[PDB]
Design an enzyme around this catalytic site. Structure first.
Site, short mmCIF file in Angstrom:
data_model
loop_
_atom_site.label_atom_id
_atom_site.label_comp_id
_atom_site.label_asym_id
_atom_site.label_seq_id
_atom_site.Cartn_x
_atom_site.Cartn_y
_atom_site.Cartn_z
N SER A 51 -6.16 1.04 0.05
CA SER A 51 -6.59 -0.16 0.78
C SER A 51 -8.08 0.00 1.07
O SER A 51 -8.46 0.67 2.02
CB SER A 51 -5.81 -0.37 2.06
OG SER A 51 -6.36 -1.49 2.74
N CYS A 68 -5.57 1.85 11.16
CA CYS A 68 -4.20 1.47 10.86
C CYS A 68 -3.23 1.81 11.98
O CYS A 68 -3.05 2.98 12.33
CB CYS A 68 -3.75 2.19 9.59
SG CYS A 68 -2.09 1.67 9.02
N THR A 76 0.82 -1.20 0.00
CA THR A 76 0.00 0.00 0.00
C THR A 76 0.86 1.26 0.00
O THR A 76 0.58 2.19 -0.76
CB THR A 76 -0.97 -0.02 1.17
OG1 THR A 76 -1.79 -1.20 1.07
CG2 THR A 76 -1.88 1.18 1.13
N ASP A 131 -7.31 -3.40 -5.73
CA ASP A 131 -7.10 -2.08 -5.14
C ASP A 131 -6.27 -1.22 -6.10
O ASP A 131 -5.38 -1.72 -6.80
CB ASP A 131 -6.31 -2.21 -3.81
CG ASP A 131 -7.19 -2.44 -2.55
OD1 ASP A 131 -8.27 -1.85 -2.41
OD2 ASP A 131 -6.72 -3.17 -1.63
C1 HEM Z 1 -0.38 4.84 3.08
C2 HEM Z 1 -0.14 3.64 3.62
C3 HEM Z 1 -1.22 2.82 4.36
C4 HEM Z 1 -2.54 2.83 4.22
C5 HEM Z 1 -3.42 3.68 3.26
C6 HEM Z 1 -3.07 1.88 5.17
C7 HEM Z 1 -4.40 1.57 5.34
C8 HEM Z 1 -4.93 0.70 6.25
C9 HEM Z 1 -6.32 0.39 6.42
C10 HEM Z 1 -7.46 0.97 5.55
C11 HEM Z 1 -6.41 -0.48 7.42
C12 HEM Z 1 -7.69 -1.09 8.01
C13 HEM Z 1 -8.02 -0.33 9.28
C14 HEM Z 1 -9.35 -0.75 9.83
O1 HEM Z 1 -9.56 -1.98 10.04
O2 HEM Z 1 -10.22 0.13 10.05
C15 HEM Z 1 -5.10 -0.71 7.95
C16 HEM Z 1 -4.77 -1.58 8.98
C17 HEM Z 1 -3.50 -1.98 9.33
N1 HEM Z 1 -2.33 -1.48 8.80
FE1 HEM Z 1 -2.22 0.00 7.42
N2 HEM Z 1 -2.03 1.30 5.88
C18 HEM Z 1 -0.87 1.86 5.40
C19 HEM Z 1 0.40 1.58 5.84
C20 HEM Z 1 0.74 0.66 6.82
C21 HEM Z 1 2.09 0.36 7.27
C22 HEM Z 1 3.35 1.08 6.75
C23 HEM Z 1 1.96 -0.62 8.17
C24 HEM Z 1 3.04 -1.32 9.01
C25 HEM Z 1 4.25 -0.81 9.23
C26 HEM Z 1 0.56 -0.95 8.31
C27 HEM Z 1 0.03 -1.90 9.17
C28 HEM Z 1 -1.30 -2.13 9.41
C29 HEM Z 1 -1.84 -3.08 10.36
C30 HEM Z 1 -0.99 -4.03 11.22
C31 HEM Z 1 -3.18 -2.98 10.32
C32 HEM Z 1 -4.23 -3.75 11.14
C33 HEM Z 1 -4.61 -2.91 12.37
C34 HEM Z 1 -5.60 -3.59 13.27
O3 HEM Z 1 -6.47 -4.35 12.78
O4 HEM Z 1 -5.55 -3.35 14.51
N3 HEM Z 1 -0.18 -0.14 7.48
N4 HEM Z 1 -4.20 0.00 7.19
#
Ligand code: HEM
Length: 400
Positions: free
Chosen positions: A283, A349, A240, A390
């Site tokens: 995403s 996130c 992403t 996506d």
């Molecule tokens: C621009 C970059 C990113 C976008 C747009 C993005 C977007 C998202 C979205 C839409 C979700 C779902 C949140 C939800 O359930 O409401 C999410 C969850 C998550 N993201 Fe990202 N993300 C990005 C970058 C990252 C990075 C760099 C990491 C790790 C270093 C990461 C790790 C995670 C994790 C572990 C979750 C699950 C959180 C949970 O369920 O507690 N993401 N992200």
């Protein structure tokens, strides 16, 4: 009958056309998944926020009616879950084990490191040059920036970053055979297991070491869990991030007045990033639930054990929240409601602050380093991800 979902994007950089029509005429509706099962699709910002936060809805994937979107998702649901798929109280029990690296204060303290990483990759790109034709901004820049950062935070030593960045890219590249992708996946898991063993013996200042000292050794989790948590942090966000960087460059090429603003004032990078994360919701398929009990959403009854998909991409184009939603305008006046590029609620996130810092550092630096950066192919010929996925960009030829 119900239409097949996921929907296809209307064109390379555009959302599926269905969402605008559903927001206007049928905001909560049934869709048909790959296996012929049904799920509810939620499209309006208010309702997506409701789905994201309702404690009557579950992320647990062994529950009846969970909306897996492909055969691979059904298979992955058999594995022991990590926090991404947990409900309270398990969710924060595990997420809190790794959240400290991702707080606003921790990310602020990381800023010099983020800047150095971006600067070093830009300088490598300058040294390599483009004297013999265009170079791929993805391979040279958009891929290594997030990869190097997350690997470093996890605990990978500097010498191993280039090879592991390449191997993780192979895992998701659309050209890889299944055997190639599976071998790269296992290579990353094998490497992380060895790293966990090392940090159990001699911890360092990294996420894996904190898991080892604070959770594995006391018996709160085991070492295989530490591997899976580290792997989650690598794979959850990396592709992403790569796509968001590439999409930002393409979006600026498509909006030359706003690119000229950013070139003349790098302090506009935060506003650019906010609009980018709303407009290109890279995403869009992660806010999924099953109903634990009957729940009314708008004019629909979601019955116990029915699945729900809440489109944050659609929410981010909801005209009732974001005026002129289908225009990219980094100068817009923002409303009180949050854009949902990073989701919402408890599962929002974990890396939202880190990701925005990476993106802000990229977009405040890239055109200072390369004021003449140009997409080298016609914008209509950009190699976007396939329309049924996506939004993203696979490769992006540039000159500078
Ligand atoms: C621009 C970059 C990113 C976008 C747009 C993005 C977007 C998202 C979205 C839409 C979700 C779902 C949140 C939800 O359930 O409401 C999410 C969850 C998550 N993201 Fe990202 N993300 C990005 C970058 C990252 C990075 C760099 C990491 C790790 C270093 C990461 C790790 C995670 C994790 C572990 C979750 C699950 C959180 C949970 O369920 O507690 N993401 N992200």
């Amino acid at each position: 009958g119900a239409p097949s979902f996921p929907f296809s994007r209307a064109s390379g950089p555009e959302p599926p056309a269905e969402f605008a029509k559903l927001r206007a005429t049928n905001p909560v509706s049934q869709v048909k998944l790959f296996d012929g099962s049904l799920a509810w699709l939620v499209t309006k910002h208010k309702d997506v926020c409701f789905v994201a936060t309702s404690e009557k809805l579950s992320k647990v994937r062994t529950r009846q009616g969970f909306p897996e979107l492909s055969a691979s998702g059904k298979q992955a649901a058999k594995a022991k879950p990590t926090f991404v798929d947990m409900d309270p109280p398990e969710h924060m029990h595990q997420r809190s084990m790794v959240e400290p690296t991702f707080t606003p204060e921790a990310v602020k303290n990381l800023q010099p490191y983020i800047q150095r990483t971006v600067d070093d990759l830009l300088e490598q790109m300058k040294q390599k040059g483009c004297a013999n034709g265009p170079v791929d901004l993805v391979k040279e820049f958009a891929l290594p920036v997030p990869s190097y950062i997350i690997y470093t935070l996890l605990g990978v030593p500097f010498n191993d970053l280039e090879y592991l960045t390449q191997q993780n890219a192979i895992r998701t590249n659309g050209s890889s055979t299944a055997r190639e992708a599976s071998a790269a996946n296992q290579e990353l898991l094998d490497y992380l297991a060895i790293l966990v063993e090392q940090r159990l013996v001699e911890p360092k200042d990294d996420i894996i070491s904190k898991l080892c000292t604070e959770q594995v050794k006391p018996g709160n989790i085991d070492k295989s869990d530490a591997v899976q948590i580290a792997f989650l942090l690598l794979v959850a966000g990396n592709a992403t991030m790569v796509n968001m960087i590439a999409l930002g460059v393409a979006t600026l090429a498509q909006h030359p007045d706003q690119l000229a603003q950013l070139k003349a004032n790098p302090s506009l990078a935060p506003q650019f990033v906010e609009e980018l994360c709303r407009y290109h919701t890279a995403s869009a398929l992660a806010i999924k639930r099953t109903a634990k009990e009957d729940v009314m959403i708008g004019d629909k009854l979601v019955r116990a054990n029915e699945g729900i998909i809440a489109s944050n991409q659609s929410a981010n184009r909801d005209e009732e929240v974001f005026e002129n939603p289908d225009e990219f305008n980094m100068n817009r006046k923002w409303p009180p409601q949050d854009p949902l590029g990073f989701g919402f609620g408890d599962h929002r996130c974990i890396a939202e602050h880190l990701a925005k810092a990476e993106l802000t550092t990229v977009f405040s630096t890239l055109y200072q380093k390369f004021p003449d950066l140009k997409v080298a192919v016609p914008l209509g010929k950009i190699n976007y991800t396939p329309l049924n996925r996506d939004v993203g960009i696979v490769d992006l030829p540039v000159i500078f």
